[PDB]
Amino acid sequence: ATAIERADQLAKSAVAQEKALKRAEERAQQLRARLDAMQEAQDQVRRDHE
């Protein structure tokens, strides 16, 4: 069962890859939120102190 066997395990390995794909891509995306937030959170201070 050489061919189809290893092909199926490569299939499943691919699947594992895509779950990794998500976790990483949207972990970056979610970090973007507070990445933004801190900016304006300093910014209103930056505007009004002067």
Binding site: A16, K19, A20, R23
Partner: peptide, 26 residues
């Protein structure tokens, strides 16, 4: 000073917690 390291130590968790799942996948 004591302020300084705390971030890294706390971030260590956030750093460390990463190792938890991706290994667990396999």
């Amino acid at each position: 000073l004591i302020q300084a390291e705390e971030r890294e130590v706390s971030a260590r968790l956030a750093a460390a917690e990463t190792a938890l799942g991706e290994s667990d996948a396999r």
